[PDB]
Amino acid sequence: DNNFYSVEIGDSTFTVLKRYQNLKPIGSGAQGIVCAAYDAILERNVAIKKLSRPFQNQTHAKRAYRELVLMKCVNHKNIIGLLNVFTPQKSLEEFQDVYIVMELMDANLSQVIQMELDHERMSYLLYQMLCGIKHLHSAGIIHRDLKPSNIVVKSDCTLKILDFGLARTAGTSTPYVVTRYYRAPEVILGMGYKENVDIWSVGCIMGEMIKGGVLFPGTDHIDQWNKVIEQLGTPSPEFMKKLQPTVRTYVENRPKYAGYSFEKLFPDVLFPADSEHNKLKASQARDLLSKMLVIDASKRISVDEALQHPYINVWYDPSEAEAPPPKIPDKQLDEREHTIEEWKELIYKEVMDLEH
């Protein structure tokens, strides 16, 4: 009569409420699989994400908390929605792993980058992505790991941002936690970050869609910076000044580039037929790209600015863009370190809170 039950997926155990059946592996979060299921009660497909003894370690514990905590208080049509949390363990003492249920979308961006979209479709997808983002920012939270694998869509052309374990507030206080290609210079050259660090990610994503391939490959964290300067060209002396001297030498030491123009980076060739009416212009896209893909963090456009931009704003709806922010329970401020015991304590209460 036990409320849960177990199933082997490879050599992973999923112990989940009987309601959830016919599991199927689907992917990984920052931490976890990630597994599609039939919620027999609700009669609809879901994604069940398992976080295996998440308090096992400082890092994990922390990410897990945020993940849970954000997943909870965040509500926006462009953020992936929570459906249920649980642990099969019966006590704080006896506790070890957590399970998260989210809605299941149709596919992640992989995927879209693949087919040739038309302006309205692309533009709109971006619009969504951005609103989603602006939601998070509107409460101070940065996503840090936006990337196609983390962005899912539905075949009615809807879109949601996903996976929050990475997500925190600005600053400094590892460099190599965010997906290598989608790393803003601030992140690559280790100088800490602010909101629009995401905007950078969005450029790489938008670009990738337009290019069909990854904007800046880069084989190692170091080669990455070559691919950036290669294309955008060497940043200003003004910018360099802000680099930690050790980094700054290596950088100044790189071969100088003027870098290609966005017209040349992004030939007309690539874009579809131009707009019905004006604003969805192949060049209008470029102009946005030009304001997003900017090495200089403080010369770089924000979500708000990007939602204003004439290639995005055709979809602008205040009820989506200027939604009410999420409230984060204020006691939580995403960095205060603890013992693995205090962490396990924290998460568990947090799961307990969230169980039905």
């Binding site: 149709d106 869509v153 052309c157």
Partner: peptide
């Protein structure tokens, strides 16, 4: 300038 409502994930 209508929103699309369909995305071919064939």
């Amino acid at each position: 300038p209508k929103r699309p409502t369909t995305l071919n994930l064939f």
